[PDB]
């Protein structure tokens, strides 16, 4: 049996909302350590890692590790029927059902939901703690705007250490944010260009953290990192 | 006939309540009240509108009148005015509506719809609920994403549904919530039709689900100082 | 040519005014002030924009520039325009630069394009001054009734399948009426076109006469005006 109670179920609503557009399903490494998820879109050009430490959950119980096949299309639709509700996630031992219980502040309205888990168990490999050439911390909003505004112009953005440049039939546009909350560290300067479509899939996680961190290097994929307070982090990986 | 209602919002929110359920209806323009009673196209629901002349600030209506009205057409006319405008209605056979504040006047071509209203009897109900309107809305809405049928059960009330992605049950315990349960009943109602009734939520916050086997459910909304909007639904 | 406008929102609300009515127009960039004159694809109405160089902080126009821009493309490239962003234009391609420290810069391709008529000041029998937003709802609320208002001297009238609808106003922001009574039926669909320029000012003047097209005029704060010439239906 797996039982996690989250007083601010809003965390779960925003997280499911974040990855909903990128992947539809994933193996959840429901472990006593925490909830780790590793998954990839249908075009196999991006990877999403979600870390949810058991410390953040007010009550966490996981007798027996478990890899859940979650249809995140159904889960996010379920979690929408809840922003202050206390969400508890209960997974009975060897049931095809993941239970999601929504308890209001006032114990007046309680709603219980069941989802049909699937068979998706892929043994997640592990990335290394890598050293990136130039990394940038900026407001999540500005990164959303830069990705959104430059998307009406071109299908891809050109990032350089910082300048965001995208070109198209309408014209060309260069957006540069100098240091100030913005902080650039460029050990070795790198110029990599990324498809804007998938970046705007990552920008759906902007309600999780106020600051987004972009790790770029020529020998590794881009790493957009949104941090979940206490619980952990949400790492997006994209290839040039 | 002439009726002046300062709180023109009441007239706006009413028409917006029924535009989706019924498209046309007869209006029993009576010296007592503006009673309307019509049924949907598919014959699975009935609305009854009571507008006491007491709520109308100036109410004339001498000779008794049965107006057939195209609510869709009237809804657009009534949604032209803002929630602050003062609304007056006049007739002799073309419904006239005037909106004060700049003053604007429109005229709606009435139609020929005179089906004789029938008498509904005050029935006893096994279970009767009084919840805050907002809860009833969300409860209906969220459950509709799951499936298209709510199973309202009653214990000294639970809304439940089962669908393709899963199954759900929402339980509410005793604004405020009251559950007079003479006999415990459980029924299944179509959520699409219920979500037409929730369009009358701006009228007031007290929604009352008078519910009982052997009779159709009656979702009642209460227009303040005037009358009430009763929504009847047939179990499946 | 370089023209820096600090109240960048103006050019935002400007381009959004013409974006719908005119898809392509010629900006005759001039030393006194940028002027635009173009007509819709149905040739029933003309818009004339006047933005004087006095409003722009720095303004240098060392030529008779005739930029054929694509207003649809410019309303787009006028996105990422924070309302308080400061926007400057330069001089075949049009550059736009936005400054807040984010400092985005854009470049636009320009079409090659027709001349400009010399519209004269002309005598209007009935001129009406009303609150700008009130005009929009008058057109919008009446629009659900019919496809044409009948403006009289001031009452607006529409007639449709649902029924007739009349809205009236009296002298009193406020309302100001003027010489000879006129009643002209005007196309509604093109009247709501002009109402998209309401964010630029709080007063609209329905300068209206019988022997000439109606002139809905909006006064851009300080910098100039935005005139709309709509012909009556018959
Ligand atoms: C052994 O070396 C590998 C190499 C690549 C992926 C892999 O698997 C994973 C490991 C860790 C984390 C996530 C995944 N992969 C996944 O989770 C998803 C399963 C469904 C989902 O959860 O979205 N696999 C695919 O998309 C996929 C299917 C088939 C071929 C592919 C080739 C390249 C990229 C992806 C695929 C294992
Ligand atoms: C799983 O966790 C990881 C961990 C580290 C990297 C990673 O890769 C990616 C990361 C971000 C974006 C895109 C990709 N992935 C890619 O760019 C392409 C897609 C293949 C294709 O173009 O069809 N390669 C593979 O996925 C692949 C093929 C064969 C063998 C492999 C062995 C290990 C890892 C990947 C492969 C996936
Ligand atoms: C967290 O994902 C990671 C993390 C770390 C490594 C990594 O990829 C590898 C894995 C094993 C062995 C070698 C490589 N890496 C390489 O072979 C070269 C290094 C340069 C060289 O050829 O010397 N980089 C790439 O292929 C590559 C570049 C950019 C984006 C990419 C996205 C997906 C796959 C590859 C790339 C993927
Ligand atoms: C004789 O006993 C009855 C029994 C049932 C309904 C009835 O009619 C009404 C009574 C009061 C108020 C309004 C209506 N009638 C209506 O609402 C509309 C027309 C007027 C309107 O749309 O407002 N008729 C129908 O729905 C309808 C048409 C044909 C057969 C039906 C069978 C069952 C249910 C409805 C119909 C009279
Ligand atoms: C009008 O005022 C009323 C008054 C009382 C009941 C009523 O009925 C309903 C109320 C709410 C929801 C749905 C229905 N209606 C129904 O349940 C079904 C229609 C379902 C179907 O045909 O699939 N029957 C009839 O309405 C009907 C058929 C024949 C003769 C009748 C004589 C009197 C009353 C009704 C009928 C309508
Ligand atoms: C305001 O709507 C009403 C109100 C009150 C009665 C009523 O219906 C009747 C009218 C005259 C005589 C008998 C009945 N009642 C009945 O026939 C039986 C009771 C037992 C019996 O008499 O055989 N109830 C039902 O059919 C029925 C159940 C559920 C929902 C329904 C919705 C529409 C129509 C019927 C039902 C309709
Ligand atoms: Cl997928
Ligand atoms: Cl972390
Ligand atoms: Cl109908
Ligand atoms: Cl009552
Ligand atoms: Cl054109
Ligand atoms: Cl002027």
Token pair, residue A239, equals: 């290839």
Torsion of CA B85, B91, B95, B98, to 10 degrees: -20
Q: Is A170 in the C-facing interface, judged by CB distances under 8 Å?
A: yes
Closest Cβ opposite residue A176 in set C73, C80, C103: C103
CB B153, CB B160: distance < 8 Å: yes
Ligand 7 centre and the CA of A26: distance in Å? 8
SS3 B22: coil
Token pair, residue A16, equals: 């499911």
CB A233, CB A225: distance < 8 Å: yes
Question: Which chains does A contact via 3+ CB–CB distances below 8 A?
Answer: B, C
Strand pairing partners for A193? Answer: A158
CB C138, CB C132: distance < 8 Å: no
DSSP string for residues in A80-95: TT----EEEEEE-TT-
- Distance between CA atoms of residues A207 and A83, nearest Å: 13
Task: Determine whether the interchain pair B170/A108 forms a contact, defined as Cβ–Cβ distance below 8 Å.
Answer: no
Nearest ligand to the CA of A52 is: 8
In chain B, beta strands by DSSP E: 2-5, 24-29, 34-39, 45-50, 58-59, 65-70, 87-90, 95-99, 103-108, 127-132, 150-152, 158-162, 166-172, 178-181, 187-189, 206-212, 215-222, 228-233
B43 — alpha (psi -120 to 50), left (phi > 0) or beta? left
- Distance between CA atoms of residues C13 and A204, nearest Å: 29
Q: Which of C169, C138, C157 is nearest to B107 (CA)?
A: C157
Q: Which of C230, C221, C215 is nearest to C12 (CA)?
A: C221
Enclosing H/E stretch for C109: strand C105-109
Question: Which chains does C contact via 3+ CB–CB distances below 8 A?
Answer: A, B
Task: Determine whether the interchain pair C145/B106 forms a contact, defined as Cβ–Cβ distance below 8 Å.
Answer: yes
Token pair, residue C50, equals: 């006047």
CB neighbours (10 Å) of residue C113?
14
Ligand 3 neighbourhood includes A46 CB (under 6 angstroms): no
Token pair, residue B177, equals: 């919530």
Token pair, residue C32, equals: 């006194």
- Candidates C67, C101, C106, partner chain A, best to mutate (most A CBs within 10 A): C106
HSE-CB of A123 using CA atoms within 13 angstroms:
0
Pairing state between β C203-207 and C214-218 = antiparallel
Radius of gyration of chain C (CA): 19
C160-165: Cβ within 8 A, 24+ apart: C162/B70, C162/B73, C162/B76, C162/B77, C162/B108, C162/B109, C163/B73, C163/B77, C163/B94, C163/B106, C163/B107, C163/B108, C163/B109, C164/B106, C164/B107, C165/B77, C165/B80, C165/B104, C165/B105, C165/B106, C165/B107, C165/C141
Chain A to chain B, count of Cβ pairs less than 8 Å apart?
46
**Domain containing C62: what range?**
1-234
Ligand 4 centre and the CA of B38: distance in Å? 7
Q: Length of chain A, please?
A: 240
Q: For chain B, give the residues followed by a break (C–N over 2.5 Å).
A: 92, 101, 156, 174
What contacts C77, CB < 8 A, 6 or more positions away? A153, A170, A171, A173, C96, C106, C108
SS3 A181: coil
Nearest protein Cα to ligand 5, atom 3 = B46
Closest Cβ opposite residue B135 in set A81, A109, A115: A109
- Distance between CA atoms of residues C54 and B197, nearest Å: 59
What contacts A70, CB < 8 A, 6 or more positions away? A25, A26, A28, A98, A115, A117, A118, A120
At how many Å resolution was this determined? 3.8
What counts of helices (H) and strands (E) characterise chain B?
Answer: 4, 18
Ligand 3 neighbourhood includes A219 CB (under 6 angstroms): yes
A64 — alpha (psi -120 to 50), left (phi > 0) or beta? left
- Candidates B74, B80, B84, partner chain C, best to mutate (most C CBs within 10 A): B80
- Distance between CA atoms of residues C216 and C205, nearest Å: 6
- Distance between CA atoms of residues A62 and A76, nearest Å: 22
SS3 A214: strand
C219, burial (CB in 10 Å: exposed 0-12, middle 13-18, buried 19+): middle
Q: What is the 3-state composition of chain C as percent helix, strand, coil, each rounded to the nearest 5?
A: 20, 40, 40
Method for this entry: X-ray
Q: Is C93 in the A-facing interface, judged by CB distances under 8 Å?
A: yes
CB A50, CB A227: distance < 8 Å: no
Judging contacts by C-beta atoms under 8 Å, the chain B residues touching residue A114 are 166-168
Give how many domains chain B has, as a whole number: 1
Token pair, residue B82, equals: 């803002």
- Distance between CA atoms of residues C140 and C163, nearest Å: 16
Nearest ligand to the CA of B232 is: 5
Sheet holding C45-52, edge to edge: C67-70, C24-28, C33-39, C45-52, C224-230, C214-218, C203-207, C128-131, C176-177
Where would I find the H helices in chain A?
10-19, 72-79, 140-149, 196-202
Judging contacts by C-beta atoms under 8 Å, the chain A residues touching residue C102 are 142, 175-177
């Amino acid at each position: 049996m797996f039982e996690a109670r989250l007083v601010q179920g809003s965390i779960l609503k925003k997280v499911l909302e974040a990855l909903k557009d990128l992947i539809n399903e994933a193996c959840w490494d429901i472990s006593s350590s925490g909830v780790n998820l590793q998954s990839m879109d249908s075009s196999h050009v991006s990877l999403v890692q979600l870390t949810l430490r058991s410390e953040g959950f007010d009550t966490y119980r996981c007798d027996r590790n478990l890899a859940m096949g979650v249809n995140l299309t159904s889960m996010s639709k379920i979690l929408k029927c809840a922003n202050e509700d206390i969400i508890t996630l209960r997974a009975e031992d060897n049931a095809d059902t993941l239970a999601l219980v929504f308890e209001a502040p006032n114990q007046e309205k309680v709603s219980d939901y069941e989802m049909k888990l699937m068979d998706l168990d892929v043994e997640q490999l592990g990335i290394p703690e890598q050293e990136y050439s130039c990394v940038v911390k900026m407001p999540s909003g500005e990164f959303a705007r830069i990705c959104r505004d430059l998307s009406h112009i071109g299908d891809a953005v050109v990032i350089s250490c910082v300048k965001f440049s995208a070109s198209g039939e309408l014209g060309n546009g260069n957006i540069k944010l100098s240091q100030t909350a913005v902080t650039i560290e460029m050990n070795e300067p790198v110029q990599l260009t990324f498809a804007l479509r998938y970046l705007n899939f990552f920008t759906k996680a902007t309600p999780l953290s106020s600051t987004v961190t972009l790790s770029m290097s020529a020998d590794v994929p881009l790493v957009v990192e949104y941090k979940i307070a206490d619980m952990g982090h949400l790492k997006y990986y994209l290839a040039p």
